[PDB]
Design a protein around this ligand. Structure first.
Ligand SMILES: COc1cc2nccc(Oc3ccc(NC(=O)NC4CC4)c(Cl)c3)c2cc1C(N)=O
Length: 278
């Protein structure tokens, strides 16, 4: 996996480094990274001061994942990197103003209606079922993309979905991986990670969406009994903002047999249908 400096290298002196976000990720403004804007706000992952060789390797590996994967609207995309001598290793990605989707949805619990009714200004900036189904559809499209690149996410969860402007959501932290609440039974018991175990996790992500950012498995200690009951077929109950069709979609993603779960291409088609029906 070679590094194409002519494509990706960005001058460190064309960044204004700002506040920490959320690794050592900071907000920054970049000057001339984008031909349509003089100044563009970006997120920068910077190698810690005193990083070990292993830690340095790891951030470089992350950069090469971002290069290799390619561009998609629903994935957090690489804009540039600072790799040359005279400063820290820095990985520059698109900025997602609203941050992670779990935190964001929780902030909107008192600003949700199933659909707006005229006069719609009574629901200014409210979330709706359309928003939630739309976020779901977008994540399915991003995972279909990742699957097509032979990439398994391994920790698909609402905390790893970022919200940008214009209700665009972006998957992050793919290929890098509490955690047990998103893991398919085969992952927990057999340590098998596949695109079908990501589909299971997508199911959990859907529950997080349609609970407006709740933590999965409320009231349950994540221990051997949790794992045993999951294996025996027990599943989360319908969350507070779901439609019946979306709940059935969760159940489908949680089929005990990985081969009987929908594919992400099937989920894109299905959610796209649910979105037009809604
Ligand atoms: C406003 O809050 C945030 C905005 C962000 N925008 C873009 C990227 C972010 O963070 C990330 C999130 C992930 C990656 N890296 C990857 O996704 N790497 C994996 C693909 C190889 C990077 Cl660099 C930066 C952001 C984080 C916050 C925040 N409050 O947490």
């Amino acid at each position: 996996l070679p590094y194409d400096a002519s494509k990706w290298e960005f001058p460190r002196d064309r960044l204004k480094l700002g506040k920490p976000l959320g690794g050592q990720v900071i907000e920054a403004d970049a000057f001339g990274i984008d031909k349509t804007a003089t100044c563009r706000t970006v997120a920068v992952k910077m190698l810690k001061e005193g990083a070990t060789h292993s830690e340095h390797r790891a951030l470089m590996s992350e950069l090469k994942i971002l290069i290799h994967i390619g561009h998609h609207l629903n994935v957090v995309n690489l804009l540039g990197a600072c790799t040359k001598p005279g400063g820290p290793l820095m990985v520059i990605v698109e900025f997602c103003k609203f941050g992670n989707l779990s935190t964001y949805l929780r902030s909107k619990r008192n600003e949700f209606v199933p659909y707006k009714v005229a006069p719609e200004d009574l629901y200014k900036d409210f979330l709706t079922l359309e928003h939630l189904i739309c976020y779901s559809f977008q994540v399915a499209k991003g995972m279909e993309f990742l699957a097509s690149r032979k990439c398994i996410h391994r920790d698909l969860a609402a905390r790893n979905i970022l919200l940008s402007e214009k209700n665009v959501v972006k998957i992050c932290d793919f290929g890098l991986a509490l955690p047990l609440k998103w893991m398919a039974p085969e992952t927990i018991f057999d340590r098998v990670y596949t695109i079908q175990s990501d589909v299971w996790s997508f199911g959990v992500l859907l529950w997080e969406i349609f609970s407006l950012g709740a933590s999965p498995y409320p009231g349950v200690k994540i221990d051997e009994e949790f794992c045993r009951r999951l294996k025996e077929g027990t599943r989360m109950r319908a969350p507070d903002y779901t439609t019946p069709e979306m709940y059935q979609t969760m159940l489908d993603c949680w089929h005990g047999e990985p081969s009987q779960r929908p594919t992400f291409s099937e989920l894109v088609e299905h959610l796209g249908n649910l979105l037009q029906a809604n």
